[PDB]
């Protein structure tokens, strides 16, 4: 029998108190929704694997399950008999089926209930976590979440590969296995883990872990990277059966004098270096090139053995960077020498002995004698062999006894070619290497192709397929269904849709196009639709239409509406200020003295942040302080039917308008990070917007150009209408309609802003980027950067200065670098905000103070006027535009013939209703009788193309 | 007719900071993690850059709500737009667009993401804008696309520069001929002068150099 | 820099192509009548009349 473990098997990973936080940790936990074995005690004590650790749970009525046995052969015995818990690590004799009734290295003595345990063995410590809770369930494990606490930690040094349970005989239990998975643990206000995300359960969990949140907003996120794994390895070396004569170098009867050292060449052989390294006959074995235990894996184009006799005190001179009587005059090594220096005492071989004599790298320049005597250590003879390794990636001839394999092509493999390794697919090559070229290289100096060590053929190496992995999801408030895109790959190694962006799995391919929702790329978008599921489709670019074009047809608006649109622009960012010394070296004299060695690196960051903070007040003033005086509206709000009560300040409140309050209600330490206040507070900004609104409403644009001069609102609108090419009589004749459309448009603004949180996303995004930047900077304080601790006080309290300073320098570099990264990002972000503020300031002058003639600059339509509203970190513009609503098809002509003269409109166009010709304004159908006061004459009927016959009335 | 060339977007590059620094290496990756968010915040910065490239493209080209097309009868009062309108025999790009496209041009964790809007989708946006501009003047911008005879549209354009519209009509044949010749000159310049599109090629070159520098540093 | 260029290009699309410009040297070196957009790799090309 088996069951579903659901969300069980989580525990507090350490002994640190945390609260109100999502913490990411990697440890041995039971995988969520894992398969666990279900055991019974009815009418069952098998030996089970321990693997990397065991999750255990049981349900009890009569406390039948009392203990466990852990070990190999089956030894750690844990038994809870009555009230006395007994833990022993003793050579106890066990039965083939041990049970309870109803030489030692360690010893300790102390359904209705669910008991959970975690058993893991790390570095000799057997760690036990547990939790007890009441239940009311017989059938199976209860579904729910709880984290287990550490209870016991046994310092045993015991090898556990298997375990067995213990039952009392006259109670079901479950066994699962732990894996090194990362979990996001949710700690509530009281520091209790209440939830968790298994970061390797599915793509939604991956998204939740990546974003460090239990809620995922609608969109596409890159959470991981796909990589094709190798299936098998390939080991290739030349098929050489001769072994290298190292014995003939080290076991030689005689060695040469140091002034005239011997050089033996080793090639075309199998080099077993385990003999030289493991041998205890050597007094020293120092490698400068490679570690002595890697010598049988890597291999050389050649090896040279330099053999000679020196004094014991001269051993220290045979090394790169050394000078002296031997190093300079007898035997010099390159300072970039690659190889091993091996030496041993030869006092019982050479000493009597004056046959040994002494006087550029590897120079043999062919004079004093040594007096080697058996009773001399520093003056005793030593035999030294220097093994010079040419480990350049050339054809290898001297390789160790590494077992070879065959060659596998057109598959992802883990390869080793003469000591050079990597992962990739081996394919046929059309490249030709020169006789002396074993390896090829790319621009990154990675291997491009190789010559097979045994076969004289060229193989191309194409690293195994990989790409980013993105999770496409609706918000988790609607659905937990996800689709996954594997970027820039084929639907091979990975309801599948192949797109140019990669392989999309889980989204249905739909023939119908829709406006783009969640973009994928290359014309493809996805959405959650119909019951509902994720679909993918080619995005629509808009509805298809066609203009009814002809040489004699014009469509002229017969009706219009006044609409109000909202444009939201950032003006300023949070005026953050970071104390670079407190951040890096918080209240630490030792660290501060080291920080000062970096000169101005710290203080110029304080300066850069100060500059950013200062320009935030400049940005705010440029946008809002465009009026010299503070204007107020009259006590009698008579604006010809236009209702501004939602944009003007509310006297009962900070004097913000009703709409401003809606805007403000939607948009939202001790580490040297502080925030400075703005010069202009919300109340002061409200007074500036009030002045601008009062100016705009009662004096039109005159307060902008100069003095604020009163004008009746209806007349102000008359100017605004002429400014868009619409005769002012249209305004007055339809004034009630226009005022009503305006008032309704504002009501629509209210309904949208109060219900759609995303309505102010442009300002919330600024807040979110700044919050993320600050959180990143603080989080970096917890990083070690190679140090023994990320906590400065823990370094100082543990190490003396000669060692502490090194660990501190590691933190200073990381933290100083973190501030530099932060500041650079703040400076670039500040440039974006400044540019936005400049745009907002331009709009304030051209949209609010004046009237714009720039298309789409002050709303999507013909601009009449605008009203500013303040918002957190920015300005919101309500743009009032004139938009054609209804149109009719009229017959037209460029000119009309009277007596042969060509008559053209002074303004407007000629139109025909099917029987009569009229002249009318371009933006509003209003047919007038064609008279000499409406048209002018230039040229004649034999010149104008498309001219038609009519009559022109002469008063 | 003069030509002004402006960059709208840059290559949507994406670099896997772990693969770049510690390519398929467990020992290196474990050391890289000691730097905390230094690696992943770079992945984030590059993602942000790539995303705003689609925003930039949409802001420039997707200014029309509907996709408009020209009529089967190309009667624009003598004005010849056949070199700026989409070619039905081809991706529906214009003759001049093909000339523009014919002049302007790994395993280290460095990959390139596709744009949301492909060359064909951009061509459909420019087609809609051209059709709007030619058959409805500026009305498709302010609101609904309302037909107007091209000669009358030009009359509005002339009044807009302080020139009485009778000048247009009396010289309509001359104006249309100068316009058509001006386009022919655009063709001759773009097809023969590689430097004509240097402003976009420079963007390509800077991005190529940036990517090549990053890869070269691996050595 | 690219974003700023795109912002300029977008402004020009609205003021040069969708409308008619009254801004000197903004939409060609002369009195602006109209413009026609053309696409190009990584950008937009404006033919200013
Ligand atoms: C301007 O609009 C406001 C609504 O935003 C009007 O206020 C409402 O008036 C009606 C009629 O007296 C009341 O029943 C509502 O309860 C009021 N609403 C609020 C929120 O106060 C205001 O009367 C309008 N002013 C003019 C002159 O028309
Ligand atoms: C122009 O359009 C407006 C609406 O935008 C029309 O006004 C509406 O007329 C209907 C009756 O047909 C009323 O029920 C609505 O309450 C009116 N709306 C407003 C805001 O007053 C107007 O009649 C149309 N004019 C013409 C000439 O067609
Ligand atoms: C075009 O407009 C004219 C002028 O309004 C229309 O002629 C008038 O029609 C009304 C009846 O609706 C008569 O009472 C007037 O006496 C007519 N005036 C003249 C000068 O004839 C004409 O019918 C309209 N044509 C179309 C096709 O709608
Ligand atoms: C506008 O009306 C005039 C007459 O006032 C038309 O002139 C006639 O043109 C035809 C064709 O060339 C000649 O055969 C007639 O003899 C002309 N009439 C006179 C009285 O000389 C003119 O063609 C009309 N134009 C349009 C566009 O209808
Ligand atoms: C619009 O301009 C194009 C050229 O760009 C004209 O196409 C040419 O027409 C002539 C005459 O029939 C042919 O000999 C050429 O071979 C055509 N060239 C190409 C490239 O097709 C087109 O006819 C003009 N249209 C109008 C209405 O004038
Ligand atoms: C205004 O300038 C245009 C040219 O830009 C003149 O049109 C040209 O006239 C010559 C004859 O003098 C012809 O050979 C050309 O083919 C014409 N060009 C075009 C495009 O048609 C026009 O005649 C001049 N007008 C005045 C009043 O001087
Ligand atoms: C566990 O695996 C076995 C064997 O494949 C299967 O029969 C059983 O249904 C699985 N149980 C669960 C809970 O997945
Ligand atoms: C529990 O078992 C231990 C032996 O492991 C024994 O010494 C102890 O007396 C037992 N306790 C009870 C209450 O029987
Ligand atoms: C106890 O361990 C020692 C290890 O040297 C072994 O020789 C001895 O026989 C063991 N005794 C028992 C009872 O297992
Ligand atoms: C914290 O404990 C108190 C009781 O002291 C309890 O009332 C409160 O609900 C707990 N908070 C949470 C988040 O469980
Ligand atoms: C080589 O010989 C010249 C004399 O001809 C001498 O000056 C030079 O130092 C010698 N080089 C070495 C490395 O001894
Ligand atoms: C490997 O063995 C083959 C014979 O099977 C031989 O021809 C080839 O030369 C050998 N390669 C090397 C590098 O010795
Ligand atoms: C999101 O979920 C919560 C909890 O069910 C619900 O109260 C809220 O209205 C939901 N919001 C939306 C926009 O669906
Ligand atoms: C995927 O591989 C198949 C061959 O099995 C090929 O026909 C297809 O074009 C490839 N698709 C992509 C996107 O590479
Ligand atoms: C789209 O329709 C065609 C038939 O015209 C069909 O062959 C194709 O499979 C359909 N594709 C999808 C995604 O529905
Ligand atoms: C003009 O006529 C065409 C063709 O019947 C029609 O599609 C278009 O909608 C009409 N326009 C107006 C404003 O009536
Ligand atoms: C307008 O177009 C129609 C249909 O092609 C044509 O018969 C008529 O002559 C044209 N008018 C002018 C002035 O070119």
Curated annotation (Swiss-Prot), chain C:
Name which cysteines form disulfide bonds. Answer: 16-27
Q: Which domain of life is it from?
A: Viruses
The role this protein plays is: Subunit of the fusion protein that is processed upon entry into the host cell. Mediates fusion of the virion and cellular membranes by functioning as a class I viral fusion protein. Contains a viral fusion peptide that is unmasked after S2 cleavage. This cleavage can occur at the cell membrane by host TMPRSS2 or during endocytosis by host CSTL. In either case, this triggers an extensive and irreversible conformational change that leads to fusion of the viral envelope with the cellular cytoplasmic membrane, releasing viral genomic RNA into the host cell cytoplasm.
Descriptive protein name: Spike protein S2'
What species does this protein belong to?
A: Severe acute respiratory syndrome coronavirus 2 (2019-nCoV)
State the encoding gene: S
Q: Which residues of the full protein are shown?
A: 1017 to 1065 of 1273
